[PDB]
């Protein structure tokens, strides 16, 4: 099908053709607002494999995120502590730029539900993602028994709780000994379990 060809073509981001297209598109994106509604996905096949359907109730937004580390917000780099906490500059955020972009889209659009997002462009200053969202109250969504899951209260603001694909990557979930720190579904839960003092009834 054509979708396989689109996927393979998009895999070649250093080719002349895709470099030209990305240059044009990045220039265009830099002139718009930070969060901006998009008429249609820029990468229909990527959106499809992330879960998008060309059906009423699915919407696409483009979010621009500033690149680089996260400077510690202190006055004149004054931390007032031991030297181990003096770092101000080479400090990296715990969440990825994609996760931050999904968070911005979700915060702005409170009545929709963030489904996913994908990379569309980047320059030295910005990274551009497109977030696919769903309107949980459109009947085209509520009557389809396959998208009904996202219309339930337990999925409110998934990006603010780190449940989207981009969000989960930062939580360190997985199987095996490499991911044993998050047994129970979260590092905080596992830490609580390991650091609770247990007093059995008969001891």
């Amino acid at each position: 099908g054509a979708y396989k060809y689109m996927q393979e073509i998009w895999r070649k981001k250093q080719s002349d053709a895709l470099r030209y297209l990305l240059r044009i598109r990045t220039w265009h994106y830099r002139q718009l607002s930070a969060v901006h509604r998009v008429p249609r996905p820029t990468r229909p096949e990527k959106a499809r494999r992330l879960g998008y359907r060309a059906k009423q109730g699915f919407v696409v937004y483009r979010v621009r995120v500033r690149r680089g580390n996260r400077k510690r917000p202190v006055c004149k780099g004054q931390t007032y502590g031991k030297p181990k906490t003096h770092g101000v500059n080479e400090l990296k955020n715990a969440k990825s730029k994609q996760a931050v972009a999904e968070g911005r889209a979700g915060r702005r659009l409170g009545s929709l539900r963030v489904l996913n997002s994908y990379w569309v462009a980047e320059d030295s200053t910005y990274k551009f993602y497109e977030v696919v969202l769903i309107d949980p109250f459109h009947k085209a969504i509520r009557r389809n028994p396959d998208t009904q899951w996202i219309t339930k209260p337990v999925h409110k603001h998934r990006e603010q709780r780190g449940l989207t694909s981009a969000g989960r990557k930062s939580r360190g979930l997985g199987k095996g000994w490499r991911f044993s720190a998050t047994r129970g579904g979260s590092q905080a839960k596992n830490w609580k379990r390991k650091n609770t003092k247990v007093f059995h009834r008969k001891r």
């Binding site: 099908g1 054509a2 060809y5 073509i9 053709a17 030209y20 297209l21 044009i24 990468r43």
Partner: protein, 121 residues
């Protein structure tokens, strides 16, 4: 944006879409295509109640549909719109058609082609 697309150097595989069928050849192509337009809304209305009381040749559309036809060498002629945006949707067709020896031309107007098919684009 229009100015930038001319100012920058365009790679050949992107530039091939700028040179489209000339006016006369395009008119001939559309004249041929208009003979096999899909079923109209009024035709559907009139046929529905007759069938309730009781598939010719047609132009096929859609990249995935056209891509399969080309790979199976079942299509005789393929017309590709020149203003497809995003362009990656049809970036492969000119080379794919030429690889399977299927005649193809980049005709002007995804909206003109959509009219032939009773669609938007």
């Amino acid at each position: 944006s229009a100015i930038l697309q001319k100012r920058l150097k365009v790679p050949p595989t992107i530039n091939q879409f700028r040179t489209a069928l000339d006016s006369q050849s395009a008119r001939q192509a559309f004249k041929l295509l208009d003979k096999y337009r899909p079923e109209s809304t009024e035709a559907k209305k009139n046929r529905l109640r007759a069938r309730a009381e009781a598939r010719p040749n047609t132009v096929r559309h859609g990249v995935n549909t056209i891509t399969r036809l080309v790979e199976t060498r079942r299509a005789q002629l393929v017309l590709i719109a020149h203003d497809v945006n995003p362009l990656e949707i049809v970036l492969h067709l000119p080379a794919l058609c030429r690889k399977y020896n299927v005649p193809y031309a980049i005709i002007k107007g995804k909206a003109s082609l959509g009219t032939v098919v009773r669609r938007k684009t």
